[PDB]
Amino acid sequence: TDIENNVRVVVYIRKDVEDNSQTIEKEGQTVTNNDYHKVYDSLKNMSTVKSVTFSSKEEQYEKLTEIMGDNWKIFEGDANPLYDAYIVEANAPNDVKTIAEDAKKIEGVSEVQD
């Protein structure tokens, strides 16, 4: 799942939408997540897309800590501020901007790094 810069789009997900969880909590029971894979589906349907990989904010938070920083006290423990993302690979770099604009239309998307 290593992608070359020139065909990578990062689609960050709204903090209020849980695209990767099949289940959620309702009335104390674990029940089905309606919104599951909506953003994933839209992205994976694009004909110029080759793969769409989930990167959970908790994953990037440990990876962020791995990349220098431990005394980041003033940020950590205080409610992880990172975003769930889809790392998307384009078939050609020519598509990247044609893909990023579309991604930013799909409801549930917060931002998109081209």
Numbering used by the authors: 52 to 165
Provide the publication's sentences verbatim.
Three different structures, with resolutions ranging from 2.0 to 2.3 Å, were solved by X-ray crystallography, each in the presence of a different detergent. The detergents used were dodecyltrimethylammonium chloride (detergent 1 [D1]), n-undecyl-β-d-maltoside (detergent 2 [D2]), and n-decyl-β-d-maltoside (detergent 3 [D3]). In all cases, two independent protein molecules are present in the asymmetric unit, arranged in such a way as to keep hydrophobic residues from their α-helical lobes buried. Different conformations were observed for the β-hairpin and the helical lobe among the six structures, depending on the presence and identity of the detergent molecule bound to FtsXECL1. These changes create a cavity in which the detergent molecules insert, with a large part of the helical lobe (from Q111 to E127) affected by the interaction with detergent. Residues Y112, W123, E127, and F126 are strongly perturbed upon detergent ligand binding, with the hydroxyl moiety of Y112 interacting with carboxylate of E127. A similar interaction pattern is observed for detergents 2 and 3; additional interactions are observed in N131 with detergents 2 and 3, which are characterized by a larger hydrophilic head (maltose). Full stabilization of the hydrophobic tail of the detergents is completed by the same hydrophobic residues (W123 and F126) but from a symmetry-related molecule.
FtsEX comprises a cell division-regulating integral membrane protein (FtsX) and a cytoplasmic ATPase (FtsE) that resembles an ATP-binding cassette (ABC) transporter. The folded structure (residues 57 to 166) reveals a central core composed of a four-stranded antiparallel β-sheet (β1, β6, β4, and β5) and two helices (α1 and α3), an α-helical lobe (residues 107 to 135) harboring the α2 helix, and an extended β-hairpin (β2 and β3).
